[PDB]
Design a protein around this ligand. Structure first.
Ligand code: CAC
Length: 127
């Protein structure tokens, strides 16, 4: 829970999380990394020196890609979401995407926030 976090090195992240960083953020420098706990659920957080932040679940699968200082790399985003954003907000870039096992939440440069379920039905749209 609150304040139970521990600092970690990159080589202590699950393999999948290390590969994700090398694939999508190869030139970023890690500023800090930690492991968090919530009951028996572990999560990992990485912040780069430019301020961009990643969170991963216990298996190193991303739950947050917060690129508010740049943009979310397009290869990270599910096609259905890319397509929806491209049609409906053609000039916006994505600053942040988060997900759990039930939904995705997307935040765009133009202030719009969109929630999709796992089948990509738009649940809520807010500004
Ligand atoms: C609090 As920050 C450096 O992840 O915007």
């Amino acid at each position: 829970g609150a304040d139970d976090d521990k600092p970690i090195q990159v080589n202590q992240l699950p393999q999948t999380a290390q590969t994700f960083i090398k694939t999508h953020f190869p030139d970023n420098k890690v500023a800090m990394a930690k492991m968090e706990t919530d009951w028996f659920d572990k999560s990992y957080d990485v912040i780069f020196t430019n301020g961009d932040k990643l969170e991963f679940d216990k298996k190193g699968i991303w739950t947050e890609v917060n690129c508010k200082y740049s943009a979310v790399p397009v290869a990270v985003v599910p096609d259905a979401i890319k397509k929806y954003v491209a049609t409906n907000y053609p000039d916006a870039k994505m600053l942040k995407i988060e997900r759990d096992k039930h939904d995705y939440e997307v935040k765009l440069s133009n202030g719009w926030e969109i929630k999709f379920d796992m089948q990509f039905n738009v649940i809520d749209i807010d500004n």
